[PDB]
């Protein structure tokens, strides 16, 4: 069951995935000691999910089968569909990032994998 609001406990590789892609040190040494509350509100198809990422809230919505336009973070706009495999897997190729968001009992597990970067949150259900 995905409708709940999920605040970082674990984040394993921060420094190496936000370098490969385009951000700055400051943010990263910022964004690294605030825990993040990342929500997600399943309809059925439709997921209306609102990341608060430091200080700037990032929100946007996919609808599983269907084309959606999501907010990359270099760029602007990325055409990537989610997936659904089991009511816990939410998988979709995103900027060359297969996100990997696997849900285990009241935890949420989001693997984002760009070639040789392993980018795992572990975010409990709160």
């Given at each position: 069951?995905?409708s ?5 406990q ?5 420094e ?25 509100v399943q ?32 760029g ?33 597990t989001?693997t984002?994998?760009?070639?040789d ?6 975010s409990?259900?709160?």
């Open positions: 069951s995905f709940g609001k999920y605040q970082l674990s984040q394993e590789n921060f190496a995935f936000m370098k490969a892609i385009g951000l700055p040190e400051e943010l990263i040494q910022k964004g690294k000691d605030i825990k993040g509350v990342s929500e997600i309809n059925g198809k439709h997921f209306k999910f609102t990341i608060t990422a430091g200080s700037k809230v990032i929100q946007n919505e996919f609808t599983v089968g269907e084309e959606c336009e999501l907010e990359t973070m270099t602007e706009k990325v055409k990537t569909v989610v997936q659904l495999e089991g009511d816990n897997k939410l998988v979709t190729t995103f900027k060359n990032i297969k996100s990997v968001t696997e849900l285990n009992g009241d935890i949420i989001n984002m994998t760009l070639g970067i392993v980018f795992k949150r572990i409990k259900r709160i």
